[PDB]
Amino acid sequence: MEKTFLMVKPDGVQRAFIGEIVARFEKKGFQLVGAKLMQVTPEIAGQHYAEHEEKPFFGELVDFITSGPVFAMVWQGEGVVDTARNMMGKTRPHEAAPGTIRGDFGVTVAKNIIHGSDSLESAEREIGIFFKEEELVDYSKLMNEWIY
Template sequence: MEVERTFVMVKPDGVQRGLIGEVVSRLERKGLKIVAMKMLRIPKEMAETHYAEHREKPFFNALVSYITSGPVVAMVVEGKSAISVVRNLVGKTNPVEAEPGTIRGDLAMDIGRNVVHASDSPESAKREISIFFSDDEIVDYAKVDEDWVYER
C-alpha cells in the first residue's frame, strides 16, 4: 500500500467557529491518520511563504492578513491517496460550488471564509508540510484499525 502525506489547516474562521473537532473527526472517520498537529498563530513571513504562488495576485495581501488574524490548526494527514481523498472531503474552494457532504459544502458560505486549507498536489503537500513542521514533529505509528480501513 502506497501511503501519502498531505497538509491540512483549519483556518481562523474554522477555529473561531469551533469547527476544529468537526474537521478532525471527518478526517479520522474516513480512515485517515493524523501524524502531526499543532495550533499556532502564523507569523506574516510564514504566511507569505505559504501563499507564495499568489504573491502577484491582487488578493495576496488580504489573504496574508486573514490567515494571520487568528490561530489556526495545522496538521499532517496520512493515508492511501491522502491528497485526493482530503481534497474530496474538503470540497471545492468556493463553498457555494462545494457539494453537500463536504466540509466546505456543509460548513462554509464564502470563499474567503471556507474553514479549511488542503494541499492540492504532492509537491504542494511536501512544501507546505516543511513550512509548518520539522521532521521530528511528525510521528510515525501504526493504528490498530488499519486492517479494517485498508484491504491488504
C-alpha cells in the first residue's frame, strides 16, 4: 500500500500541535507506520542540499539544523500522498482553507507547521532519508476491515 512522509516542522513542535495533527490522520483512517522525534543534522541536510533549487524543502532542512526538533512520520493508505496534501492545505497558510491543518493553525509561509511529500517519487526519497528500514513497522490494523 501507498506511503507518504509527513513532518511536523519546529514551529508545530513549539506551538504544541503534534497530538492534534496525529489525531487528524488517525480519525481519517490512515495507518501510522513510522514515527520519531528527532533533530535534523548536517549529515541529513547535506545528503540532498545540492537539489534545493528544484526542491525547496532540501533548503528548509538546513534551517532546521539550528532551530529545534521535528516530528517525522510515515503514514500508509490508499491515495495517502495526495490526500495528505489536501488535509494540510495550501503551502501558504493565507491561501489554505479552514478545516485544513495550515488553514486552522498557520499564519505565514515561513512557519507553516507541516511538510508532506508532493508526489510518490518524493515520498520514497524522503522516507529513505529519515527512516531506516527497520524503523518502519509492518502490522495489521484491525479497523482496516471497515475502512477499505
